């Protein structure tokens, strides 16, 4: 669950 | 080459060819073609999670992710990959698990050579340097910093108390202290431990890849071959382990811990050995259905009944290779933490009452009834995170069930039931109680995050008070579910058939917009309604008994729907500013039963006392605690509030919450169901006559219980936005508590939603869209929250940027306006061919048919609320974007966002934390001390006129 | 001549106008006021002729003769000479007629006394008569009896002056139309120049004049000052003309009317002829049956006529008409069910007569009502200084020159013999009866001659007369109690250390806001009160504001029993509604307020409702919306520009479809709602101290939390409703077509700014330059209609400016002859000296400075600047002070910018009413859609 650049 | 597919099972409603293949390297490769898509895509999954790392450097699995997108030796420029693929329409992202990695991203229409040998370069070789391990860890580190305050401390907290020499108990972020200093306080390299760790996991057979490619299934798999060949098998075995991580030391436990956010749940951890082995009969999905199940009888209803417990999830939650856990994690009450002994004393009488009765054929057959149905109509699929799914259940199936995943069920063994539910019982149990009451009674502390909580290990009174005498409270099984559908027909299309939805019915309660299904031909259809009232947003007391009244329903309303949810039909019921709302969805036999329910639910509703007086404070304890939420957040909530009309704020509503009484809501909904208006849109699978009858039910019912009138047409108002001076520099700060982070939104305000002055705003943010991330974040490195792009509430668009870090905001609006001085120096300065480059990365963007059908029902539905009515400007904005110039840009940018401009509009919010490369001359501040005075000096914008 | 008889006059101590009484040789009663603290000076002339002397071909000659009074003297023989010197020295004068006066009235800025009596006085010495006076006025005429032909009073009047003998002068006409001026004489070929020199030279010159002056002067030089200019009216000796016989002379008593009107209104009108009491000043008997029949408190005549649901309101008392004769009225409103028991109703009324005739006369009650107003003539204020004149010039010639100031407010002796007469009089036989209803339709023939009602002779047949004189008793009515309402402290409160000459907010809370004013000019035994209580539930709907009305409403019609006798003792209150919210004003003597304003919050937080009350206030006001198809077209287009031109406003169509949904339950549900949670601003001025002030207002803000549990509001949900902002460019029109009114309104609206301090004196300057020709070239020259106005327009802190002109034209001909005007006015700047110039902006100056003459003058002006959160106080002496720094360039900037037909900045919108037989604005909702709105202005 770690994401890269986040989301929106 | 070494094995290929000849046809594996795919749904009989796809289009999309499909093969599988193996490489000579042992990567699994599958191969998607589709001759109608537009944009192209791939993904890849290496099987090596965060718990493979080694003991003394925490988290180097994310920080080689997290290093890998910059940099390579084929490529030596830092954002290539990047900035290829935000000049084609993409955007690419990764994370990690505890036992893989998944890599993907997407494409424009044909860029498959240049962005996939981009993508391959990933792992067939990767350049690091000094810079970037140098500047990536402060990226890392903000990561960690979001997540000290984020409760979801609750899943490290049972990481730890575990087997403490079990690879279970591993940290997966790092916090730039594990990372950085730790390594450089004992001089261990980190570099060196990088390229062991990828030179020794991530090359060998163990990734498995899939591409979704539009030209054929042979034009593109001779191009797989070729072009990942390099990467060549270590010979790794997967790494896995027999040995469950709790020993019987650590069961019959029952944990104390405080949030920071007010909270009060209760969860029961069962450990059970591996059932993946089992993916045809699933018995933990059975028991999952059978514990988990809200409705007429059951665990749940019966808890909600005795005013313990709101709600309650079940099923069994996936861990490691070796091991699993099940899971009955329930929410609590006022005096739900007074009775929690007998609360899992019913648990195990629903356990027990299901124990002695066991298995049960029909709950099966209805339950692979629903999952085939469920299969056969499977909706369209974005081709983004479809094929990062497909590869990331691709380790596990063989070739032909490579999509029949948790769809399709073989047999009903009853022997494997009896497995899993012999190991359910309390010598298994581990309690876990979370509350803000533990405030000074916690011994222990958490290192890594930072949490309070205790050992208070359950003496065998409660067990042998748990398993002594177990017959039954008021249970019972499921029954049959009668929303399950049986039509399946397709109606064919109406000779007078529209493009766009058409207004079909006018009149002064209610009008319509309606739209046969043309390209889908799934028999199902989502409808969705707008009630209007003036009497819901008029004070704070009036805003407030809407959403309990509305809640209310919802919650009495759940025992009856929760079948309809399961089976196929979905609704949702919320408050909006101007009056309420309802949207239903699902397979298109049983929507108006449950439409006609909802509205006699609505209209002739009573109040059970106890459910409003357990409501009303756990909406008490869901207002007081924006407090503890993120500082940017609240900055875009502060922004709104003073860039509308009329808003109120969070401090008004828990006030008048010292008023709402029982018979104050109970005289409410007579006042607010009185005079009304309903705006509506049809879509999907439906006839005209049938839309006009659906229509006609909804406002009969209301008009037969509720005594409804029409509103007069000068009472339907929106809001206005308040209109910024013509040169303007707006801010005002507050101060977040618990965050120890900074946060700002700086907002620039062009105009009114124009046909030619979208394209300027729209053009001007995709051309800032990858430098404002790399000169930023990747560069600057000014946090991990960066965002900039055109803002439209109540049709006035502005262009703004949200941005929170550790740093004091002025720092931040100074570099803002830095980067807006270097974006035009280097707008100037740019060729006509990146120009054009641009417009058609906009156009490919923009101009994008939406694939599943509440796609294009949440494209229609989210501007007919806006009032504008334009289907069209899909294509007609686009045409107009086409014919533009780069002079007409830096036009736009002059008058508007320079910081010499005659029009200037700017509005500044910043959240400040608990305890506080030429940036040109900027003009005083003018400080907003009353938000009421401020909105009052200032004009407010006209509404935009329809279509 | 230079003839003198004067003395002391009687004057209440409060009083310092020194006065002077004389006659002149010629026969003129002469009154001489010197005040030198009076800004603006006024004189006055009182021509003792009236309608009833007009001749017998011809009808209203008086009305025609003092409307050609006006123009041309032969010392000015100019036209508007006297309307422009006064327009420059910012006077105005307005004259009126009746059957037995014609009363000629100005005033002046400062000193121009000898200048506007050099061209007031010589109207007796040489009127002109010429073409175009005559031609002109002739159309003024004609306009001034096309309003009053819906106007019900004169409709009403004229049918009972002629259904009586027809041969009597009181059923001539008084007024006159186009038929009797200009459309019978000359087809008989009568001059009538000739014939008004007849009657302005036989029937002026001789007798009776009343001319008195406000000067501020001196004791002398107003003296020979008027001696000077009044020795050319020469004695004729004309006989005093009065009536020795009644116009109901025995054909005309024991009948009945049925009266059809426009407006759906029912009323009762009884009348009794009397004989002359009007020497008889002593007792003043009428006075005494006036107050003891409509007297509205326990036990009365009203009280149960509202206990039986028939009646609204009544009143009644002496109604004096010529010399000769007097009238005795009683008229009373009638209900739905009152209309079925007329007869019923008017027996009540002989009962309470007799109940009069059963216990006598009285005694105390003479001595209370001598007493009230001997208290009443103590303390007076000072009146404006324009018709002050003209109301002792009109009472000059029926009392002697110590009776001129004491004129009704003393009493001698008492008279029950003729208290025995007048009751003698009213009986039975002697009844005169006439009914107003709308349900007499297709029933009355019979048709006035001018107006054109109609009406039925029907007399009341014998067993209803009978009925009402043998048969006579008493029920429930008694007469009086002590009112103990008197107020007995008379005492003035010394002004302490907090010596403001401004109100000052003496409290500031989240519940209430306080403003504070002790009396320092005018030392009264005096208090005024203001109230707003502001809540949002005021104007949310049309059904809510519906439910606010009848809630003031019946509140009203709860407390007037217990507030007549106080009202009788002189405090007075209102109850009415603001958009916002509600509105208090509490006005009156200082010493019984405090328990008045206590009763009424106590009142209307406790409230509840009586069924058939409920009911008639309904009906009533169902009918009194619908009423407003009916009302005079320049209404009309004031009413759609205040609906176009604000945030949200609902129609009167709106509120009549939202009537109906009202009900009990459901108003004694929205009662707490409004009440719950409020906001309180207050004004207290008068002579009063801060801590009882503070007091005053914590008693009512802790009675109303006692009540209803009042808790203050947020500050951001006081908000007040803005104003649309006009295109720079571009105008915009819309129609509504009248139904009643054969005449077609046009209001011209024009957008400037908000209210800057320089913004406001450009668009006043402005508007006094085009106001005075204005009614020079359109009504008197143009002759376009007589509603014709023009100038500011102050609304929602936004400013404008207006042309309201009725008349019976094609709309667009009109708004194209306005803009003519304008043209012309814009060279007419230019061709201006530095003289007219600067006396304008003299006129500007005097006509915005002045002092108070009340504390509810002040008072009130004070309080229309808070209700407006403007709270300027002193924008008068700083805008003044800005005002003189202004040059002719200026105004010409001004005009072009915003107000030229080429203009970058002209924002303008009209509103054409047609009769029943650019853009438009289809939807007012959707012409409101996309525009944008104006801010507030800032407070302070």
């Not at chain 2, 084609?88 to 890599?103: I, K, L, M, P, R």
């Not at chain 2, 999830?313 to 933490?337: H, P």
């Not at chain 2, 930072?450 to 409270?473: F, R, S």
Request: aromatic share 10%.
């Amino acid at each position: 669950c770690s994401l890269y650049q986040l989301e929106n | 080459i070494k094995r290929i597919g000849n046809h594996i099972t795919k749904s009989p409603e796809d289009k999309r060819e499909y093969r599988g293949l193996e490489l000579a390297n042992g990567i699994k490769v599958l191969l998607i073609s589709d001759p109608t898509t537009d944009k192209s895509s791939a993904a890849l999954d290496v099987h090596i999670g965060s718990l493979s790392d080694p003991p003394n450097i925490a988290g180097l699995s994310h920080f080689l992710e997290h290093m890998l997108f910059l940099g390579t030796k084929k490529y030596p420029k830092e954002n290539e990959y990047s900035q290829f693929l935000s000049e084609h329409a993409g955007s690419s992202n990764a994370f990690t698990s505890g036992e893989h990695t998944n890599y993907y991203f997407d494409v424009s229409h044909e860029h498959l050579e240049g962005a996939l040998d981009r993508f391959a370069q990933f792992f067939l070789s990767p350049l690091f340097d000094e810079s970037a391990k140098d500047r990536e860890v402060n990226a890392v580190d903000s990561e960690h910093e979001k997540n000290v305050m984020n409760d979801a401390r609750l899943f490290q907290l049972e990481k730890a108390t575990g087997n403490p020499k079990h690879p279970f108990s591993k940290f997966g972020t790092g916090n730039k202290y594990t990372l950085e200093t730790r390594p450089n306080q004992e001089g261990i390299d980190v570099r060196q431990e990088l390229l062991k760790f990828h030179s020794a996991y991530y090359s060998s057979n163990l990734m498995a890849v899939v591409v979704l490619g539009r030209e054929s299934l042979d034009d593109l798999t001779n191009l797989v071959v070729k072009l990942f060949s390099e990467v060549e098998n270590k010979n790794v075995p997967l790494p896995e382990f027999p040995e469950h991580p709790f020993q019987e030391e650590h069961l019959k436990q029952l944990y104390k811990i405080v949030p920071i956010k007010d909270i009060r749940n209760l969860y029961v951890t069962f450990p059970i050995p591996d059932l993946q082995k089992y993916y045809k009969s699933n018995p933990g999905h059975y028991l999952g259905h059978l514990i988990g199940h809200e409705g007429p009888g059951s665990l749940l209803s019966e808890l909600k009944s005795k005013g313990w417990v709101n709600t309650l999830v079940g099923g069994q939650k996936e861990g490691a290779r070796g091991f699993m856990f099940f899971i009955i994690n329930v929410d609590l009450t006022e005096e739900g933490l007074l009775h929690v002994e007998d609360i899992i004393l019913h648990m195990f009488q629903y356990i027990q009452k299901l124990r002695a009765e066991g298995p049960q054929e029909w709950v099966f057959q209805e339950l692979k009834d629903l999952n085939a149905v469920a299969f056969r109509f499977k909706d369209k699929e974005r081709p983004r995170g479809y094929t990062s799914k497909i590869a990331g259940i691709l380790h596990y199936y063989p070739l032909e069930e490579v999509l029949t995943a948790e769809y399709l069920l073989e047999e009903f063994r009853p022997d494997l039931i009896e497995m899993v539910l012999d190991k359910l019982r309390p010598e298994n149990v581990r309690v876990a109680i979370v509350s803000k009451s533990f405030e000074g009674k916690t011994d222990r502390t958490e290192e890594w995050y930072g949490t309070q909580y205790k050992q208070e290990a359950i003496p065998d009174e409660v067990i042998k008070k748990w398993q002594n005498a177990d017959l039954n409270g008021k249970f019972k099984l499921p029954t049959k579910n009668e929303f399950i559908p049986t039509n399946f027909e397709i109606l064919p299309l109406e000779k007078e058939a529209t493009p766009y939805p058409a207004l079909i019915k006018d009149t002064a309660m209610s009008k319509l917009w309606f739209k046969q299904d043309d390209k889908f031909f799934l028999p199902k259809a989502n409808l969705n309604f707008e009630f209007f009232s003036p009497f819901a947003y008029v004070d704070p007391l009036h805003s407030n008994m809407a959403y309990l009244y509305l809640e209310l329903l919802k919650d009495s309303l759940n025992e009856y729907a929760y079948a309809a949810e399961l089976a196929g039909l979905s609704y949702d019921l919320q408050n909006t500013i101007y009056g309420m709302y309802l949207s239903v969805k699902g397979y298109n036999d049983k929507q108006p039963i449950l439409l006609k329910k909802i509205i006699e639910k609505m209209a002739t509703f009573e109040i059970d006392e106890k459910r409003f007086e357990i409501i009303k404070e756990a909406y008490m304890r869901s207002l007081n605690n924006f407090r503890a939420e993120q500082p940017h957040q609240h900055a875009m909530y502060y922004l709104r509030l003073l860039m509308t009309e009329v808003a109120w704020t969070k401090d008004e509503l828990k006030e008048a919450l010292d008023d709402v009484t029982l018979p104050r809501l109970k005289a409410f909904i007579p006042q607010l169901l009185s005079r009304l208006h309903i705006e509506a849109l049809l879509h999907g699978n439906i006839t005209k006559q049938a839309a006009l009858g659906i229509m006609q039910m909804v406002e009969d019912t209301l008009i037969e219980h509720a005594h409804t009138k029409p509103l007069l047409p000068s009472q339907l108002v929106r809001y206005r936005e308040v209109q910024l001076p013509d040169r303007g520099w707006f801010v005002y700060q507050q101060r977040n508590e618990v965050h120890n982070n900074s946060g700002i939104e700086i907002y620039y305000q062009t105009d009114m939603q124009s046909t030619s002055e979208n394209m300027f705003l729209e053009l001007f943010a995709q051309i800032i869209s990858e430098p404002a991330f790399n000169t930023l974040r990747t560069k600057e490195q000014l946090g991990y929250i960066v965002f900039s792009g055109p803002r439209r509430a109540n049709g006035i668009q502005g262009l703004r940027f949200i941005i929170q870090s550790e740093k004091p905001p002025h720092y931040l609006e100074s570099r803002v306006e830095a980067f807006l001085i270097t974006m035009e120096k280097s707008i100037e300065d740019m060729t006509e061919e990146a120009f054009q480059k641009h417009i058609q990365a906009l156009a490919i963007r923009r101009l994008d048919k939406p694939k599943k059908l509440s796609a294009e029902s949440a494209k229609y539905w989210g501007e007919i609320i806006s009032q504008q009515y334009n289907f069209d400007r899909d294509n007609t904005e686009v045409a107009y974007l086409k014919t533009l110039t780069k002079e007409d840009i830096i036009k736009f940018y002059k008058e508007m966002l320079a910081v010499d401009a005659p029009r200037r509009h700017k509005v500044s919010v910043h959240v400040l934390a608990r305890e506080m490369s030429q940036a040109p001359a900027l003009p005083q501040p003018e400080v907003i001390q009353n938000m009421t005075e401020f909105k009052r000096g200032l004009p407010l914008f006209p509404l935009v006129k329809p279509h």
